[PDB]
Amino acid sequence: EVETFAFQAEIAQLMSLIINTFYSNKEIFLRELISNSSDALDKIRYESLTDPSKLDSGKELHINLIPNKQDRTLTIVDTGIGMTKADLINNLGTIAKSGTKAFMEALQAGADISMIGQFGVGFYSAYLVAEKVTVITKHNDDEQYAWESSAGGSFTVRTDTGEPMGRGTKVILHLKEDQTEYLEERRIKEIVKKHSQFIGYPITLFVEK
Secondary structure, three states: OEEEEEOOHHHHHHHHHHHHOOOOOOOHHHHHHHHHHHHHHHHHHHHHHHOHHHHOOOOOOOEEEEEEOOOOEEEEEEOOOOOOHHHHHOOOOOOHHHHHHHHHHHHHOOOOHHHHHHHOOHHHHHHHOEEEEEEEEEOOOOOOEEEEEEEOOEEEEEEOOOOOOOOEEEEEEEEOHHHHHHHOHHHHHHHHHHHOOOOOOOEEEOOOO
């Protein structure tokens, strides 16, 4: 059972801008997704302060970066609060309509695409480097779901029968053929050191056979 949805027009506009604008500084996608993971980890940490059972679905709070050159994917995994089905459908838990409005206005007041995270829609910077994005998520309180979009104005949601996550979110970036530098260990390390050096959770870069 796969449900197909239309993006809100403003989000489709955001995605088209990200995909079609000439903008060389694509590496910021990774900063933005790691920032989103950190925010999600902060949320489940805060809930656990008053209700330890919130971590029954997993104690460890971390971020894993998993490159796979055979599949041409970069996966960002976190054990944060996750997303419900409703959150996924509602623009992956963002206020993306108002955020896009503000970001558009800013690109007119001088801003550039690297500022996207200040408008709460940093997730969509994934489409700087990905032709398709899959988001697998599990929130306490809902089942595990898979969201997917290749852009083009629609996304799908389905129950995920894949490998169970206990809690959190996995963003699978199906990289564009000319963006495979983001699978290289030395490039990923460089970007994490440059942009994510004060993230308060362990970031583990997996290596490949």
